[PDB]
């Protein structure tokens, strides 16, 4: 028998081992293949109560390749090293978010 350690979680895909740059590339590729609009969000604090995160620039309406999305994540990461960063996917027809996952956590 083993007792479970107390650890803070971050919604979807937070239980799996930390995502590699190849794995994040594959998840973003899924968003573009379905035809959803990718967007980057960032926040100072991670709380269950708050549901709005400050939008990074604007939604990427004209994205052809997954490399364009990852380049926008790296721009926000270099600017804000101590902020949480997540990737969201807007659907226009259903008018709802389809995928949302955290890509960066505050360094030290």
């Amino acid at each position: 028998m083993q007792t479970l350690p107390k650890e803070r979680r971050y919604e979807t895909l937070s239980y799996l081992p930390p995502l590699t740059d190849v794995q994040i590339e594959k998840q973003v590729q899924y968003i573009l293949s379905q035809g959803y609009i990718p967007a980057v969000e960032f926040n100072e604090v991670s709380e269950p109560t708050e549901l709005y995160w400050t939008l990074w620039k604007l939604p990427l309406f004209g994205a052809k390749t997954s490399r364009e999305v990852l380049a926008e994540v790296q721009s926000c990461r270099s600017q804000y090293p101590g902020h949480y960063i997540r990737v969201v996917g807007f659907d226009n027809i259903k008018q709802c978010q389809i995928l949302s996952f955290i890509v960066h956590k505050p360094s030290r």
Binding site: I37, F90, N92
Partner: protein, 86 residues
């Protein structure tokens, strides 16, 4: 002059529509319209259908997050009034 016929290969990939047929679950409206001098009939009808529904001539980032054809009123028929100008 040299004219030719051809076969081709293909690469592949908004308010006044007279082709549209009204549905059984639609709200229909009749307007008696009088435009200002120097304004076309089809332009005036398209202006009424736009301004009474959603408006939105210029597309913003918020507008692209939704369907544009789903929530939109359209003009489908123009009929002239007998013995009257414009």
């Amino acid at each position: 002059s040299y004219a030719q016929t051809k076969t081709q290969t293909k690469s592949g990939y908004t308010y006044y529509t007279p082709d549209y047929t009204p549905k059984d679950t639609d709200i229909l409206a009749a307007f008696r319209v009088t435009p200002q001098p120097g304004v076309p009939f089809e332009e005036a009808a398209a202006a009424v259908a736009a301004e009474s529904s959603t408006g939105t001539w210029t597309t913003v980032w918020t507008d692209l997050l939704t369907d544009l054809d789903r929530y939109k009123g359209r003009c489908y028929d123009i009929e002239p009034v007998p013995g009257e100008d414009n």
